[PDB]
């Protein structure tokens, strides 16, 4: 099966982080920076990393019942479907925000059948990404107490982020891979980190702009839509590195060259006019050909 | 190029009224109850109907600046993007709810990065789809006042479906259509009714367990993913239906089968068998070739 990327403008795909619409492209402020976000993640022959899900529907959910111990609220954590989180494959039930040392403003609401008859189900409350009581690879995540969880203890809900904030003395940091918790020998299951190819590229960035308070530029290493492609297609990875076109829509013009590596990410050649960030964001991706890891954008 | 669904486990796939995973798939007991969704909705050459768009990530979701006018609040409506809706152009923007005649409980942020540099960006408020002030075809829809709708007046926001209940005096009705286009006009670009075609076929509903109260089970006709498969592909439509395969994900063998005709959706003969059966819910379509209206299931 021959290797592709999506047909489909980058502008009409969403973020692998947030369930959102793609509106640019960015390098980072230091070209050495090293992403390792847990969402987004696929090897360009279709296996699947960290928290990444097929579905953009799952993008920064969370499932589980809510508990009461002592005055400590909490989830106990299962898959986005209801069936329970082994941490065979993950660091997190799939999913899961990949947002670390912050403040998570979930919004909820009651997930059984037998609970949602009448009433209102909703609610909302902030979870912390940081602490040993942010323990998502062991099961548990604590809830901070709003006064409104007790009506909910016992109950399943699935969690949705509908906004971020900074942790108290901290700034919000887009970049911070969450402690997701480590149990004895058992692996930690994350995606890798990405490390910066160096002479010339960058690793380009997807953003969609976000609820992420005093940071609302939300940055992954791929489309949610790539991802899925990939997974579908299974398509052998007959080279190191995959030659992009970014091309215009209407006029079929190529407007810049880009490189997919096979552990799922992108980079560029920034130029005299700003890098990608000044390129038009409804463009179409094409897959040239495999080339050598050492192409010359 | 030749046609194809894609190869996802159906329960990886989201529902397309609602982001949500699917977990069932069933035929309705109300034969007589006609499908007119307008999300989930394009043509197996890659046509997209009524409100139907290709991300997941819009699915139930509104975009807009908050007004107060004449001592009511509303929403002047824009694409998800941003960018403007062309008021009579299609239904409504894409991915607007297709819920009609009920309550829609919606989430919602500012998106203006100046906004959100710091504060809480986030409120809720309901929406009726129903009244003449439920407009949004013509561009607006009236927010229900909770008293906390001033601070967001002039601010653009995103909003979310979280959940929806029934209006008061009515019951929870799925199938209803929204009066988009309120008294002035029937919208334009409507998608068309689905009728089953015969040959002892019913039309097959993807369920997604989800808090529309009182009927916590929401129907759709397309998974989303395949919405944007078929938009991604473009493959021409060669026969009367396609026929699919329900495999299993693993020995690949037939566990059911479907035909998908063009309008894009599918059918099944169910019960074969006077049926003590269930099939399972991770099971994978697979397009095995055109065949004629006349293919007996
Ligand atoms: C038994 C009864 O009449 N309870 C009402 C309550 O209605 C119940 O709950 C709602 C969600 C719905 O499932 C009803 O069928 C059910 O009887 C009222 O809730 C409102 O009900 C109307 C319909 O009659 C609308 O569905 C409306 O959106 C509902 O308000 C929402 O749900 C409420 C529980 C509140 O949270 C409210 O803020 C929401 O907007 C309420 C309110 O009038 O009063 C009784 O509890
Ligand atoms: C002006 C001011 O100091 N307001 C604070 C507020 O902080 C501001 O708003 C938050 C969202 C964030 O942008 C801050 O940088 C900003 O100064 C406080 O909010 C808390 O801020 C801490 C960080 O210092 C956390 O981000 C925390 O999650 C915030 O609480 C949330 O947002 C608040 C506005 C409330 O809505 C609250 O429910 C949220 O938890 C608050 C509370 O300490 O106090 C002032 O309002």
Redesign the interface.
């Known amino acids: 099966k021959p290797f592709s990327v ?3 403008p980058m ?5 692998s982080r947030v ?3 793609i ?1 640019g492209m960015m390098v980072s402020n230091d070209q050495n920076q090293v992403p390792q976000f847990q969402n987004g993640r696929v090897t360009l022959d279709g296996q699947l990393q960290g928290t990444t ?7 920064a959910r969370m499932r589980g019942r809510i508990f009461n111990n002592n005055g400590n609220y909490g989830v106990n954590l299962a898959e ?2 209801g069936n329970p989180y082994h941490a065979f494959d993950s660091p997190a039930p799939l999913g899961f925000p990949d947002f670390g040392n912050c403040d998570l ?1 979930m ?1 909820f ?3 059984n ?1 037998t609970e ?7 609610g909302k409350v902030v979870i912390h990404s940081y602490d040993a009581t942010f323990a998502p690879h062991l099961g548990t995540v604590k809830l901070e107490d709003n006064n409104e969880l007790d009506q909910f203890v016992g109950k399943e809900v699935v969690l ?1 982020l ?2 971020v ?1 900074n942790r108290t003395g901290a700034t919000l940091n887009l970049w911070a891979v969450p402690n997701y918790g480590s149990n004895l020998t058992q692996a930690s299951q994350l995606a890798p980190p990405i490390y910066p190819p160096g002479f010339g590229e960058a690793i380009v960035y997807f953003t969609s ?1 976000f ?4 940071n ?2 939300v940055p992954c290493t791929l489309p ?2 790539f991802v ?2 990939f ?4 398509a052998p990875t007959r080279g190191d590195a995959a030659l992009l076109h970014y091309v215009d829509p209407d006029t079929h013009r190529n407007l810049g060259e880009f490189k997919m590596y096979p552990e799922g990410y992108m980079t560029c050649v920034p130029n005299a006019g700003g890098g990608p960030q000044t390129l038009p964001i409804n463009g179409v991706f094409v897959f040239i050909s495999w080339v050598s890891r050492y192409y010359q954008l």
């Open positions: 999506p047909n489909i502008n009409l795909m969403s973020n369930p959102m619409l509106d899900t097929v579905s953009a529907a799952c993008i986005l479907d403003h919004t609401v009651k997930i059948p949602l008859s009448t009433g209102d189900p909703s949705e509908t906004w904030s702009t609820p992420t308070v005093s609302p530029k949610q839509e899925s492609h997974v579908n297609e299974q």
